[model samples]
Target: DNSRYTHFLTQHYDAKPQGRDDRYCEAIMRRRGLTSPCKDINTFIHGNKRSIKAICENKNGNPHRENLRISKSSFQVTTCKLHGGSPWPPCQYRATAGFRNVVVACENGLPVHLDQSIFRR
Candidate 1:
């Protein structure tokens, strides 16, 4: 139960456009205190619960207002999980640009569970 995600989303990985000309993964990993490279890093933003139909229904059974959970408040953060012989510095990642609809859930007031599709298009 770490609120570090809240801090990370707001401060380090806030919804700002990343430039295509720079090495975003390297720089971002450094600032966020990931000294070693592993595998993947994912950050996505989207509407909320009721809209997804995977979690649960809203109080009013309406998808409109409830889906808009990612509003004026929401933040998140986390790290790389790899073992064995993953090298550092030379780590690579594909930068995902855009604040798209990656559904999330909120408990009390903080954000949690950023969901994306396993199917790639």
Candidate 2:
């Protein structure tokens, strides 16, 4: 069932976002191989809140996130429920209900550690 739908994803996630502009963000999602809105949520959901302190880390011993202009991300938990009425009709509206994030130790140099978390239900 998820086969063809996965093909049209084109980018990391096609779901609506509250953010103003996610151009760079979505581009990153595509590179991660999410290929679907469902895949995106499941891949990056985490129940625990991470610390805010920044670390001096780099990617591949070089600053990729910085060179590529990547920033940390935050997300919220999302829940799905049946809409009242009729033969379990497909949802007409979509809403976000969680907080998720992307973390990098250093925007420059090389990455020692990166914090990527997700939730799937």
- lDDT agreement of model 1 with the native: 0.40
lDDT of 2 by residue, 24-58 (tens): 23333445443333222222222322222222232
Residue 16, model 2, lDDT = 47
lDDT of 1 by residue, 56-120 (tens): 23422223245434322232222222223555665554554443333455554444444333213
TM-score of each predicted structure versus truth: 0.46, 0.23
lDDT: which candidate is best? Answer: 1
Question: For all the candidates, what are their Cα RMSDs to the real structure?
Answer: 8.2, 12.4
Give the count of colliding residue pairs in each prediction. 3, 25
Error of 2 at 114 (Å): 21
